[PDB]
Amino acid sequence: STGSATTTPIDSLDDAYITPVQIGTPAQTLNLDFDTGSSDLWVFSSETTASEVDGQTIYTPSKSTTAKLLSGATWSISYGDGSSSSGDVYTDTVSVGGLTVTGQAVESAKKVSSSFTEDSTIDGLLGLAFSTLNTVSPTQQKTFFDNAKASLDSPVFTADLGYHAPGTYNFGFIDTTAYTGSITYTAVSTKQGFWEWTSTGYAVGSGTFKSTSIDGIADTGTTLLYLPATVVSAYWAQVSGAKSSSSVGGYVFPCSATLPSFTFGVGSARIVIPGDYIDFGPISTGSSSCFGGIQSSAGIGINIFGDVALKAAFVVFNGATTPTLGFASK
């Protein structure tokens, strides 16, 4: 089997991407944030504290003839950006882009943090990291991909995120029309439960390539590119007037600037992030200070190849017995 679904930015800055997912019988379609940095599929629901729902579409398990309470199971998750959610668990039928899993754990939120409430466009998350990170207790549950894997034509999914435009998540096949040149595959460590890999270096604009190992995770659920302070300082030093602002929470730059590109290495291959991808717009409405899309990972504890990086590439998440990651230009 295979599946193919379009993923759409939630706003004009590509702050996140939503993908429609069918849950239950008859189908209830919710727009979920596909997140390769976590492993829970959770949804706003009829059980979510009413004051914490503000415009989201909810899953109502009592209206699904295939929903079953997973008796005794609870979940609770906290994300790197400080947001959180928790609740109980149902199993139900879940379909993405024509690919159907029966008996999928659908985690129903009883509580969500304010960041989730305030984002009316995101109805929940669909985790695509390794199932060892799943938070369901006392019986850990499998991700959608893990459940689908044996049925797929090939045990893979791909992320093809757009810049200020829709893109695609495919399951079970590689669309050879979706990228240019060849796909360069690179090793993955699953020891922390993430799609963790090692970039071979970077360049700023038309500058020379610096060969250096940068360990980090491929994370579709993180907006920006978080890299070591040395790398980030080297990038912003090429933008006149750019500076790190404690008050704002990172690097900002004059909105009058033209941003240089940023290149990252994948083995001997190179992925170029155009400068415009690094512009996240005025820090507040009307400001001439703009927020940067490359930020320091210092004090996150990990480097994160988030959407800023991933949207410059066609990315293969290969879930074979020994997982790997593939990157192609597009």
Whole-number Cα distances in Å, 24 to 45, 59, 147, 318: 12, 9, 16, 28
SS (H, E, C) the chain: CCEEEEEEECCCCCCCEEEEEEECCCCEEEEEEEECCCCCEEECECCCCHHHCCCCCCECHHHCCCCEEEEEEEEEEECCCCCEEEEEEEEEEEEECCEEEEEEEEEEEEEECHHHHHCCCCCEEEECCCHHHCCCECCCCCCHHHHHHHHCCCCEEEEECCCCCCEEEEECCCCCCCCCCCCEEEECECCCCCCEEEEEEEEECCCCCEEEEEEEEECCCCCCEEECHHHHHHHHCCCCCCEEECCCCEEEEECCCCCCCEEEEECCEEEEECHHHHEEEECCCCCCEEEECEEECCCCCCEEECHHHHCCCEEEEECCCCCEEEEECC
Cis omega before residue 138 (within 30°)?
A: yes
Resolution value (Å, 1 decimal): 1.3
Same domain, 11 and 158: yes
Same domain, 130 and 189: no
Encoded tokens for 14: 């590509």
The last residue of a domain, from among 157, 174, 191: 174
Same domain, 193 and 320: yes
Whole-number Cα distances in Å, 3 to 152, 155, 172, 288: 9, 12, 7, 43
* 300: containing domain: 175-330
The last residue of a domain, from among 155, 174, 193: 174
**Domain tally, the chain:** 2
**What is the C-alpha separation between 239 and 227, in angstroms, rounded?**
17
The last residue of a domain, from among 146, 174, 202: 174
**Closest of 299, 295, 301, 327 to residue 314, by C-alpha:** 327
| Experimental method, per PDB record | X-ray
Residue 55: which CATH number? 2.40.70.10
Q: Which residues form the catalytic set? A: 35, 199
Q: Which amino acid is at 278?
A: I
